[PDB]
Structure 1
Amino acid sequence: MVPISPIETVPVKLKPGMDGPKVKQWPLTEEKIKALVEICTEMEKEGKISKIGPENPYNTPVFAIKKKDSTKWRKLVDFRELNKRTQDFWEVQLGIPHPAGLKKKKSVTVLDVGDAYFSVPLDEDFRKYTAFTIPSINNETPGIRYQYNVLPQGWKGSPAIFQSSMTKILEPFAAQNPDIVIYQYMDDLYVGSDLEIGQHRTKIEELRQHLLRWGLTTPDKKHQKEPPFLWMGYELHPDKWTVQPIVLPEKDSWTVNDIQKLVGKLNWASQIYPGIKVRQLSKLLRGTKALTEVIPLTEEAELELAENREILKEPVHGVYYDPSKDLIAEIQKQGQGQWTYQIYQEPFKNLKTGKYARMRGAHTNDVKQLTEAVQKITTESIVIWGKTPKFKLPIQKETWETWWTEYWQATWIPEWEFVNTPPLVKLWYQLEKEPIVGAETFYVDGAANRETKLGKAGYVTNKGRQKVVPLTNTTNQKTELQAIYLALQDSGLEVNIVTDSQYALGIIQAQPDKSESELVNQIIEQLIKKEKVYLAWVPAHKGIGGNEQVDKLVSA
């Protein structure tokens, strides 16, 4: 008998104030009872469970099920109630590594640690809460009572405690063997290295010895599945990586659930498949909750789906990370607030790809969306590679310089260079800083009756030009914008505009190039056509002539 070190016990408590579960045991057939007695008898000799006395007041129901071909009976302890009362744990398995951040490994071995799972002991002060009862034959003897000594399958804290226990054990081996890597996921251990194949297993044998130090039986994974590895939906080839086989189903009556899984495949495929668009397909989900409702596809959604099918006609693969090479990210505008990007180190060899869709809002411009895309790629790159990539952007250096130096918000994008890939991001209009000499001055104003929704909008200029238009089904804010629109329509290439509308000021000073409001889009179209526009604001009802004159004309 060789002594084995004891695995350190994680202390576990219940939620404050809550007590253990007290769920009644269901009635079971005579054959299910007989089957559970044989299963628990074997596990008792293995040390997984132990018989207890009648003083334990806690209970968890047991079940017996069978599978398709394996004419066997298997247990099931419904720990649903105990999990509700168990404390929260630190789940160290939230994030999954992305293949684009991994480095090439010559040799990779997979070990099975499922048998090592049952060597992790459960906190002795907590085992009482895991009690369960096997009903007796004909209910004529006291039921056999058991409690768990190891981490039970289905218990809330089993994955966190098992993974943390393995990490603590593997910690000195990895620190003293820097030429290898050890990754843990479920009941598998993945060990990779760039050593030649003869020496690689020498490290593996030393790992089996180090694990035997705690009495952990770790043989090779039974039925060694050949590359690629089917891990977290990826295909990890020795030299490259990709996504498991995407297959967009062919259908003619798409429902809520179909498009929900459709955007799920397209989002999951956009990591490596460049140019994926999901805007028109996702906006059909906006406000539907019944997953069985059928919605006709818009012609711009079928075109977007058909474009996705041609992108998905051939499998696309990605390369692994090389720390010696630079990290480069390139973005392209796709329209309708859609953006696509590729991250690579050498040209034509993407580490990964991705997309960005604009946020919800009434007004926006391309420069803001490009900026948001840069921030998303930056944060994503910090996760995957721990560094910011160099950006290649479809915006000229002068355009960005004009934007950030004049924009009212603070903004910044990291090291980047212009790449001439149309469509380019540009500034479509630039308001003047000072009043324009020789340009006509338009004093605009609008007003609307809140009761009948009738309104007026128009202007008066320093050359005597005037206009007032009667409006139906409008508001004060809409008439204020309509008045500015009229001044732009009826003026020359250069014009000074004076308004008292703080609402219109806030919209225009945000510099949008596209809006959901058709009226704002018309104003933007007029601003593009102009050479110089100076927009000035004044307080309303303050005796300011021109403003007050047109205020009287629109007040009805």
Structure 2
Amino acid sequence: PISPIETVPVKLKPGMDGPKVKQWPLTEEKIKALVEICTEMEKEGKISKIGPENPYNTPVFAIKKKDSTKWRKLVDFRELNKRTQDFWEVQLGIPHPAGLKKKKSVTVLDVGDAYFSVPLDEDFRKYTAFTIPSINNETPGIRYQYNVLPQGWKGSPAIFQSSMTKILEPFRKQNPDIVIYQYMDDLYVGSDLEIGQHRTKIEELRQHLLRWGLTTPDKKHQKEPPFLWMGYELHPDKWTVQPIVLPEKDSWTVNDIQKLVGKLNWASQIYPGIKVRQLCKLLRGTKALTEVIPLTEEAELELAENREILKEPVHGVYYDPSKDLIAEIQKQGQGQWTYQIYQEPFKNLKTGKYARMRGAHTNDVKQLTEAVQKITTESIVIWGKTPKFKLPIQKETWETWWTEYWQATWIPEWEFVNTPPLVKLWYQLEKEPIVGAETFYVDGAANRETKLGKAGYVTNRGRQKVVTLTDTTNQKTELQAIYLALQDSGLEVNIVTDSQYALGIIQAQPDQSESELVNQIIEQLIKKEKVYLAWVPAHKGIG
């Protein structure tokens, strides 16, 4: 029902006019239906007939939703919404169940339709105008306007939540134990009061909201634990993952395989073990969404082993502020990481995975740093704090690497957890030239336009080689030059190049790239006992 709540002023988008999109022609039936819905809606004080002086409009539609098989009313605020101002960000970020504080009792009220009880800025009410079509066209359709936050109007969400906040202000301070959380159509009330008191309390709240027009459904349409959440079942002392199923069948469309690959990937976070390589493979060279791709043995298998992991259940523990927040991370392959955040062993609040990018130029300690970091952000967001870290890296290693890296980089307080594979430094360019090691003056170059070039080297001790490349680039020749020197030397080499990319590799000593060639080079680089890379400028007589 309408209310004694302070309306918020609303304006249109920078110099704009209200919508004037004529009413579609309706069925005598669809009309009747709408009129009735309307005389009802009018009297609950939600809308009010208006007239010719209102020039505005939006189309009203009639959907016979066979859910209650009567005609439901729909109003297309699409156009009004394009012309409505902007509001501050309706803060997006679903809270995470593992960030919920464990309350001895918890209640969750669906304040859904509460928004239809918040009045609209009386000045803006002219824009939400609409019409009910007459049968004998060009006979005045019955015209109206909303006195309340319309459903599907740009502002309703923004406004309703602020109203709810002001309305809850009193109670929230009148009850410093009552922890209430507001989000979309949901009020989460949890405390450590005894069942009976708490119950009583939820009743106070509900009356209080009834005090301003916000009616809460209480018996016939209530919500009893567990409480749902996009695939969450809140419980008393754990949260659960509403099971998810992989649509079984034997006629897989491209659509179906994408969506599938979709759910599978969404799942891989809380279900480390889900793999999708062979399902993705069925996508190769496809020519249509409806294209039916038969599955290889492997797809079937993987797709099968996955239904297994899902059959399983992932429980979670709640936040106990009196306890440590911890985060362990482990490396699943070069650049793929898993972590789990817990306070007491095995009782974890959250777990996750980061299938990485395969950057154009990196190293593992660097990527570790980046996972630590994304975690940290995520922790702070959920728990307002940052976990003590447990990581698969010796400390001398952190040290050895970061104290000298060119980039500023850091990882907050942590401890080394010795559970493999440990992340470390695959190679380490020497600091000074290697004495007694051959010195390969290398060089390569190519007709940038015809793409033919050569690459090779010459050494202080006699050896030499040269190759002629086809469909190459100056960069690649310069590189192959170093490759061959690596290939043809002993365990200790001193190599000299004037390739600037080699200037990079010395600074950043990569261990993964985009170039197969640079990779070969990392491979060869790891293979030696000592390798000193010296750079010298070009066209000068160095070598």
Distance 1:464 1:296, change over 3 A: farther
- TM-score normalized by structure 1? 0.90
For residues 277 and 200 of structure 2, the distance between their equivalents in structure 1, rounded to whole angstroms, comes to 52
8 Å CA contact retained: 1:445, 1:457: yes
8 Å CA contact retained: 1:271, 1:352: no
List per-residue Cα deviations over 1:499-551 (Å, max 9, x = no partner). 1111233245432223343322222222122111111111111122xxxxxxx
Number of residue pairs matched by the alignment: 543
For residues 301 and 152 of structure 1, the distance between their equivalents in structure 2, rounded to whole angstroms, comes to 48
Which residue of the partner structure matches residue 421 of structure 1? 419
For residues 204 and 194 of structure 1, the distance between their equivalents in structure 2, rounded to whole angstroms, comes to 13
8 Å CA contact retained: 1:272, 1:317: no
Which range is displaced more, 86-95 or 529-538? 86-95
Q: CA shift at 1:461, angstroms? A: 1.4
State the SS of the aligned residue for 2:315: coil
State the SS of the aligned residue for 2:341: strand
Distance 1:188 1:540, change over 3 A: closer
Q: CA shift at 1:128, angstroms? A: 0.8
Alignment of 1:63-74 (within 5 A): 63-68=61-66, 70-74=68-72
For the aligned residue pairs, the C-alpha RMSD in angstroms reads 2.8
Q: CA shift at 1:37, angstroms? A: 2.0
Q: CA shift at 1:459, angstroms? A: 1.3
Q: CA shift at 1:28, angstroms? A: 1.7
Distance 1:271 1:324, change over 3 A: farther
State the SS of the aligned residue for 1:308: helix
Which residue of the partner structure matches residue 275 of structure 1? 273
State the SS of the aligned residue for 2:443: strand
Structure 2, unaligned stretches of length 5 or more? none
Q: CA shift at 1:51, angstroms? A: 1.6
8 Å CA contact retained: 1:270, 1:353: no
Distance 1:287 1:355, change over 3 A: farther
8 Å CA contact retained: 2:114, 2:214: yes
State the SS of the aligned residue for 1:178: coil
8 Å CA contact retained: 1:441, 1:495: yes
Distance 1:357 1:297, change over 3 A: farther
For residues 187 and 353 of structure 2, the distance between their equivalents in structure 1, rounded to whole angstroms, comes to 33
8 Å CA contact retained: 2:358, 2:512: no
List per-residue Cα deviations over 1:37-92 (Å, max 9, x = no partner). 22211222221111212111111122222222633222222222111111122243
List per-residue Cα deviations over 1:168-197 (Å, max 9, x = no partner). 100121123121122234444332111111
8 Å CA contact retained: 1:183, 1:191: yes
Distance 1:370 1:158, change over 3 A: same
For residues 262 and 192 of structure 1, the distance between their equivalents in structure 2, rounded to whole angstroms, comes to 37
8 Å CA contact retained: 1:79, 1:155: yes
Which range is displaced more, 17-26 or 463-472? 463-472
State the SS of the aligned residue for 1:535: strand
For residues 285 and 181 of structure 2, the distance between their equivalents in structure 1, rounded to whole angstroms, comes to 42
Distance 1:319 1:375, change over 3 A: same
Q: CA shift at 1:126, angstroms? A: 0.6
Distance 1:231 1:276, change over 3 A: same
Which range is displaced more, 395-404 or 285-294? 285-294
List per-residue Cα deviations over 1:9-38 (Å, max 9, x = no partner). 111111122211111122222222222222
Distance 1:98 1:288, change over 3 A: farther
For residues 58 and 182 of structure 2, the distance between their equivalents in structure 1, rounded to whole angstroms, comes to 31
State the SS of the aligned residue for 1:95: coil
8 Å CA contact retained: 2:2, 2:119: no
Q: CA shift at 1:275, angstroms? A: 4.1
State the SS of the aligned residue for 1:36: helix
Q: Tell me, yes or no, if structure 1 residue 214 matches structure 2 residue 200.
A: no
8 Å CA contact retained: 2:316, 2:347: yes
For residues 295 and 366 of structure 1, the distance between their equivalents in structure 2, rounded to whole angstroms, comes to 37
8 Å CA contact retained: 2:243, 2:311: no
Distance 1:62 1:20, change over 3 A: same
List per-residue Cα deviations over 1:271-317 (Å, max 9, x = no partner). 43234455776687799896445567788877765554443341121
Which range is displaced more, 255-264 or 519-528? 255-264
8 Å CA contact retained: 2:22, 2:57: yes
8 Å CA contact retained: 1:363, 1:516: yes
Which range is displaced more, 8-17 or 266-275? 266-275
- TM-score normalized by structure 2? 0.92
For residues 286 and 158 of structure 1, the distance between their equivalents in structure 2, rounded to whole angstroms, comes to 45
For residues 181 and 280 of structure 1, the distance between their equivalents in structure 2, rounded to whole angstroms, comes to 47
Which range is displaced more, 367-376 or 450-459? 450-459
8 Å CA contact retained: 2:49, 2:143: yes
For residues 307 and 408 of structure 1, the distance between their equivalents in structure 2, rounded to whole angstroms, comes to 44
Which residue of the partner structure matches residue 105 of structure 1? 103
8 Å CA contact retained: 1:364, 1:513: yes
Distance 1:132 1:113, change over 3 A: same
Structure 1, unaligned stretches of length 5 or more? 545-555
Distance 1:113 1:402, change over 3 A: closer
